[PDB]
Amino acid sequence: MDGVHDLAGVQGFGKVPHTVNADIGPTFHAEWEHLPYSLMFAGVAELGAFSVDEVRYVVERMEPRHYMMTPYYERYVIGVATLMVEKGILTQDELESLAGGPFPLSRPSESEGRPAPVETTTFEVGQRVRVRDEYVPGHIRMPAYCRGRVGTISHRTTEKWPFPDAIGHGRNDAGEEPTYHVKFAAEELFGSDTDGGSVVVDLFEGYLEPA
Amino acid sequence: ENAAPAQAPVSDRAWALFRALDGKGLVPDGYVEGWKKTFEEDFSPRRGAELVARAWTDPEFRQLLLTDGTAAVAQYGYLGPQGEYIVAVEDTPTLKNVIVCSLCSCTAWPILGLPPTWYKSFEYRARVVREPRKVLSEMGTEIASDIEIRVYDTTAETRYMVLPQRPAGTEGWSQEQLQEIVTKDCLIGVAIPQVP
Ligand SMILES: [Fe+3]
Ligand SMILES: [Mg+2]
Ligand SMILES: [Mg+2]
Ligand SMILES: [Mg+2]
Ligand SMILES: [Mg+2]
Ligand SMILES: [Mg+2]
Ligand SMILES: [Mg+2]
The missing domain is CATH 1.10.472.20 (Nitrile hydratase, beta subunit)
Known part of the structure; x- marks a missing residue:
């Protein structure tokens, strides 16, 4: 949202x-x-x-x-x-x-929410991923600054949790996914208009695609 | 135009919510009081400080903390609500880590304590992701130009703590002495541990 x-x-x-x-x-x-x-x-x-x-x-x-x-x-x-x-x-x-x-x-x-994505990829540490260029009117745990942006996997969680876009609406189809620590260069997110180095966002598998 | 909605005093609204639920038998005896005690007395950055001091003096624990934070924290019995999957992030001579929840207030409650008002502020939530050096500087922490700043946005279930660099002048200090200089702000990542 x-x-x-x-x-x-x-x-x-x-x-x-x-x-x-x-x-x-x-x-x-x-x-x-x-x-x-x-x-x-x-x-x-x-x-x-x-x-x-x-x-x-x-x-x-x-x-x-x-x-x-x-x-x-x-x-x-x-x-x-x-x-x-x-x-x-x-x-x-x-x-x-x-x-x-x-x-x-x-x-x-x-919004009635949406189910856990049917098609996702298990990503590995070091792999380059893009945040899916998607717009979700209900609950989502993706801040807009990373939508469509590319980063590198630093961690895949060893636990899995219900997809927020589903369980945030009380739906029965949240399934379970791991999340990924995705490291983005500051310039990937804010161009020249940042004083930082990198930003790591903890993103559900269903928010990601191969770069 | 753009005016605030009429509202009863917040205390009256909060206690109304309590009374409405309690009056229906939905709140067990001593329930909110028990949580209040947990929030005030058990969830504490003293716990995170203890973990840092141990990591600083015990290379094996340091390795465990940085590879399986959950297991390391479980050894102390400090897993809890909003702190079930823990990742500790390592500061280095070229890297400073900082934690935020840009979307709300997500914090490793049991080991950092409940987040402070400033961490939940729109100012911190908006700015630290984009200009962490300036934010830290304004807060009183100068990060040297040769150090990358990495901001962890707490957007899912991972709950983070910063393992700061151990400052010079603390060689041979006891775990108790070291714990003392690891503050809440050090664990969030906005402060560097200070030696008198
Ligand atoms: Fe939050
Ligand atoms: Mg927006
Ligand atoms: Mg007010
Ligand atoms: Mg649970
Ligand atoms: Mg600026
Ligand atoms: Mg030493
Ligand atoms: Mg001594």
């Missing part, structure tokens, strides 16, 4: 709000901040209501201006609440009644 959350390479932001080793304060800066992660785990591990991938996607589905003005932990409150309503576990009415006011949620999905 080509949403505003796909931030890598966006220009115009200021300084990162940190100097190295500065005191970051407590883990949680407010008494509610542990709730989104804890209730995500309740949803995933206890209820089996959704996957972690579905949580990433529901946050991607926040209305774009809403996403941009919402602090991190609050996005996950909104995302988890949205999933609970979409899965029929909760109603928006009861959330707003309990909250004592408006509780706007993420927007409905505009």
Whole structure:
């Protein structure tokens, strides 16, 4: 999904709000901040209501201006609440009644997702690969800066996981794929407009093709 | 035009979500409290520091950590949520590694601790992939011109830690002494371990 959350390479932001080793304060800066992660785990591990991938996607589905003005932990409150309503576990009415006011949620999905690709290649360390030149309106774990770009395999995972584009929509056809650490030269991604060396992206097999 | 939606205070919304689920019997007794304790007390960059200090003083463990990070971390019992498949990445005299999740906040929670606000910032997520040298410089870390910077974007299930170079002046230090100088920022890759 080509949403505003796909931030890598966006220009115009200021300084990162940190100097190295500065005191970051407590883990949680407010008494509610542990709730989104804890209730995500309740949803995933206890209820089996959704996957972690579905949580990433529901946050991607926040209305774009809403996403941009919402602090991190609050996005996950909104995302988890949205999933609970979409899965029929909760109603928006009861959330707003309990909250004592408006509780706007993420927007409905505009894609049913897609299955794990039927045709993929097992790649080896050192092989040159291209990121498939594909556009996916639903969940995908490929940042746009690498779409269509060429890099070299530095690692093939020894474990396999469900394809995010499927399991991020709660589909039954996510299968399993390993992922690959793909090393791209900075200039391959940003031309002359970068000060870096290389970028390594961890890409599902189904996002790749031989170069 | 472009205005924020009306919203109840975030605390009220977060506790509403808790109460709605809890009131339906969907949240076990002590569940969120137990996670809070895990997040605050167990998930910690002290664990990553312990791993680095061991690697620095034990060539065999260093080799294991760099070839099968998951197995190395499992020896300490530090695998966990958002830290089940671990890869450690080696800094060298010509290479500096830095970790980000450009798409959200993906972090090796059990060994680095939950990500700090700055790591989840739009500034870091947008900029470090494209201009890591300038970002690090602004953050207080000057990377010498003869050193390649490699940014690992945490886009799938691999969860990363940086194994920084061991600084001069620490020869013969104990594991406890070495752990002390390996900070959270060293494990993320934005800082180099400092010797007083
Ligand atoms: Fe993330
Ligand atoms: Mg985009
Ligand atoms: Mg606000
Ligand atoms: Mg699992
Ligand atoms: Mg620039
Ligand atoms: Mg030495
Ligand atoms: Mg001594």
